[PDB]
Amino acid sequence: GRENLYFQGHMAWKDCIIQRYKDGDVNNIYTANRNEEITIEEYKVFVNEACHPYPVILPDRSVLSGDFTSAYADDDESC
């Protein structure tokens, strides 16, 4: 963790993380609950329970890739 935005220590993100690839490179980072519709540039996207956005391709042919935020932002869980 470093200083860009003030999030160091703990970081409550959603269940699923949706990376928006624009032109073959990761442009934006989105996140959604399992079974949740987000919106990306007025395109609404439903993320399934296993963290996968639908549809995966946008009208721009932006590539969406969903994974669990668990293995991304993680959010250091208090024990």
Angle at 50 between CA 14 and CA 43, to 5 degrees: 65
Measured CA to CA, the distance from residue 56 to residue 69 in angstroms comes to 17
State both tokens at 8: 């160091």
User: How far apart are the C-alpha atoms of 65 and 43, rounded to whole Å?
Assistant: 15
Sequence positions preceding breaks in the chain, C–N over 2.5 Å: none
* Strand ranges of the sheet holding 43-48, from the earlier edge strand across to the other edge: 36-40, 43-48, 52-54
Domain locations along the chain: 1-79
3-state SS, residue 12? coil
Task: Tell me the residue length of the chain.
Answer: 79
From the CB of residue 57, how many other CB atoms can be counted at a distance below 10 Å? 12
Distance of CA 75 to the CA centre of its chain: 14
